[PDB]
């Protein structure tokens, strides 16, 4: 099929075993649908102690990524990638990732992901080496690895053959499995009823309600259908 | 010091080696500041094939987590945790994580994190076993593991002794390290000037500008100081 190549720059490549050896993503790798290839800046040093950090000009308490080893790793990856590979830097200054963002990134046959450690990377590397800066969320982590893994996992689902909802813009509906009663709680009868049309409508109505209650801002980005407006109005009225 | 305990429920506990064997978080574990303990629902099965998924009532193309193995793993973890441990389910329906959210979660000496696979878990388990539902972002992943790892990494930074900015509400300023020129790009002179006061003000002004340009909504949640209003107005005017 149409595979995907992901180059990764990281001081901790082994972290990426978490997505390449396990589950859906581990299957995608075994089936050559997804390929993840790592370069460690530490391999690109020349001093005895393999120094990969550097002090920031203007002072400040933290450290940055040494420019030369990082720059050399990026260039190597760009070369092994060949043409067309987009270079993504994960950081809290980047564009905020959401599923629309994932769909766009997914359209790239080749990606290179730069995972920063310490307090960041030199701003000049961002201008010259980085095409897009992205954030997986407004929280602060110890490094760009986990966001890179999150990105990889998210886009991998778009690769044909990888998988075996939410696209309506709404939160998911409540799901139920065995047993029929649990701690004296029972499955909603309509799910047993066998009526696929009653069931579809009930699930949709739940999603509308749950989105309304939990994430009302998600509802303003939406141009609801006749049916959805109906079912939401019913659910809003019944919350009284 | 004041350590942290994190119980984890996952079909893929080995994924968590990515945070427990590496970097800052790997150090926190080695120094008993952070403890991560995993229970696999697969260990709680009794059938020959260690079945951990189950069909959803009302039909639908996907699978859910079998209730019994998952429920038994949760209960075991709650018991090993003892009193006070809060139980977090990671999912796209949860409350949206941000750093404020991380600061709150961080105040818990004990956490238990439930990582869902397949298309989710039974809604009745959520009502009875789960205290808080959280999302790391509006994107869809193959499982709750990476969000759980993200959460762990984020809160770990609040544990005293773990670490060795952004709290002003603003994006970070541009950072620079060796060399002084790079691809014919030079370090802003003021960072060389040695004037800690000029430097502080220049960095602040950058953050104000970068927040304004990249994340203007972050600026509306802010009650700017006299100084910040000054420097922002200057930066807005100079964007002309
Ligand atoms: N969110 C994210 N999406 O992508 N990366 C994300 C992230 O958190 N990266 C962190 C490693 C970088 C970082 C930057 C600044 C500081 S600080 N304020 O201590 O100087 C600490 C850590
Ligand atoms: N974001 C997140 N924050 O925490 N978990 C997050 C997440 O993405 N979890 C996914 C495993 C669960 C999931 C749910 C529904 C479907 S679906 N729409 O294919 O039925 C697929 C996957």
Q: Which two tokens stand for residue A149?
A: 């893994």
Residue ranges in chain A assigned as alpha helix (H): 17-20, 23-30, 67-81, 99-106, 123-129, 145-156, 189-192, 196-214, 226-237
Q: Which residue of B has its CA nearest to A149?
A: B146
Was A23 annotated as part of a binding site?
no
| Whether B138 contacts A99, CB under 8 Å | yes
CA of B141 to the centre of ligand 2 (A): 5
Residue ranges in B136-175 assigned as alpha helix (H): 145-156
Q: Which two tokens stand for residue A32?
A: 């050559």
- State the residue for tokens 């490549």: A13
Give me the phi and psi of A115, to 5 degrees please: -100, 110
Helices first, then strands: H and E counts in chain A: 9, 9
Was B176 annotated as part of a binding site?
no
| Whether B86 contacts B132, CB under 8 Å | yes
CA neighbor of B96 nearest in space, from B143, B138, B57, B129: B138
CA neighbor of A166 nearest in space, from B58, B91, B116: B91
Domains of chain A: 1-165 (3.40.1280.10), 166-240 (1.10.1270.20)
Judged by CB atoms closer than 8 Å, whether chains meet at B119 and A178 is answered as no
d(CA B58, CA B8): 30
**Which ligand does the CA of B146 lie closest to?**
2
- Structure letter (DSSP) for residue A56: P
CA of B107 to the centre of ligand 2 (A): 26
The pick from B102, B114, B130, B140 for probing ligand 2's pocket by mutation, whose C-beta has the most ligand atoms within 8 angstroms, reads B140
Resolution, given in Å to one decimal, reads 2.4
| Whether A40 contacts A31, CB under 8 Å | no
The pick from B22, B172, B174 for probing ligand 1's pocket by mutation, whose C-beta has the most ligand atoms within 8 angstroms, reads B172
Nearest atom, ligand 2, residue B117 CA: 11
Judged by CB atoms closer than 8 Å, whether chains meet at A137 and B140 is answered as no
Write out the E strands in chain A.
4-9, 34-39, 53-54, 64-65, 86-96, 110-115, 132-135, 181-182, 185-186
d(CA B12, CA A22): 7
Q: Which two tokens stand for residue B113?
A: 């994190």
Q: Is B38 helix (H, G, I), strand (E, B) or coil?
A: strand
Beta pairing, strands B34-39 & A4-9: unpaired
Q: Name the minimum distance, in Å, from the CA of B34 to any CA of chain A.
A: 14
Q: Name the minimum distance, in Å, from the CA of B230 to any CA of chain A.
A: 22
Was B116 annotated as part of a binding site?
yes
The H or E element containing residue B199 is: helix B196-214
Q: Which two tokens stand for residue A55?
A: 């002090």
Residues of A in contact with B55 (CB under 8 A): 177
Of A14, A93, A175, which is closest to B122 when you measure between CB atoms? A175
Q: Name the minimum distance, in Å, from the CA of A125 to any CA of chain B.
A: 9
d(CA B38, CA B89): 15
Residues of A in contact with B123 (CB under 8 A): 174-176
Q: What angle do CA A142, A54, B154 make, to 5 degrees?
A: 5
Which residue's CA is minimally distant from atom 13 of ligand 2?
B119
- Structure letter (DSSP) for residue A168: T
Residue ranges in B116-169 assigned as alpha helix (H): 123-129, 145-156
Residues in chain B: 240
d(CA A73, CA A43): 8
d(CA A201, CA A231): 8
| Whether A141 contacts B19, CB under 8 Å | no
Q: Is B105 helix (H, G, I), strand (E, B) or coil?
A: helix
Judged by CB atoms closer than 8 Å, whether chains meet at A64 and B120 is answered as no
Was A176 annotated as part of a binding site?
no
| Whether A132 contacts A96, CB under 8 Å | no
Judged by CB atoms closer than 8 Å, whether chains meet at A99 and B140 is answered as yes
Of A125, A183, A203, which is closest to B128 when you measure between CB atoms? A183
- Mutating which of A54, A99, A137, A147 best tests the B interface, going by the most B Cβ atoms within 10 A? A137
């Amino acid at each position: 099929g149409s595979h995907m190549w992901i180059g990764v720059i990281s001081l901790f490549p082994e972290m990426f075993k978490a997505i390449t050896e396990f589950g859906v993503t581990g299957r995608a790798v075994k089936h050559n649908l997804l390929k993840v290839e790592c370069w460690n800046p530490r391999d690109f040093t020349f001093d005895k102690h393999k120094t990969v950090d550097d002090r920031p000009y203007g002072g400040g308490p933290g450290m940055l990524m040494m420019v030369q080893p990082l720059r050399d790793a990026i260039h190597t990856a760009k070369a092994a990638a060949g043409e067309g590979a987009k270079v993504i830097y994960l950081s809290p200054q980047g564009r905020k990732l959401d599923q629309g963002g994932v769909t766009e990134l997914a359209q790239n046959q080749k990606l290179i992901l730069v995972c920063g450690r310490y307090e960041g990377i030199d701003e000049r590397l961002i201008q010259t080496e980085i095409d897009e800066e992205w954030s997986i969320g407004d929280y602060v982590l110890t490094g760009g690895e986990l966001p890179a893994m999150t990105l990889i996992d998210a886009v991998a689902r778009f690769i044909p053959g990888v998988l075996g909802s939410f696209a309506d813009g709404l939160l998911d509906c409540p799901h139920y499995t065995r047993p029929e009663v649990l701690e004296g709680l029972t499955v909603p009868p309509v799910l047993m009823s066998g009526h696929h049309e009653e069931i579809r409508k009930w699930r949709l109505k739940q999603s509308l309600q749950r989105t309304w209650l939990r994430r009302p801002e998600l509802l303003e980005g939406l141009a609801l259908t006749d049916e959805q407006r109906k079912l939401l109005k019913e659910a809003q009225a019944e919350h009284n």
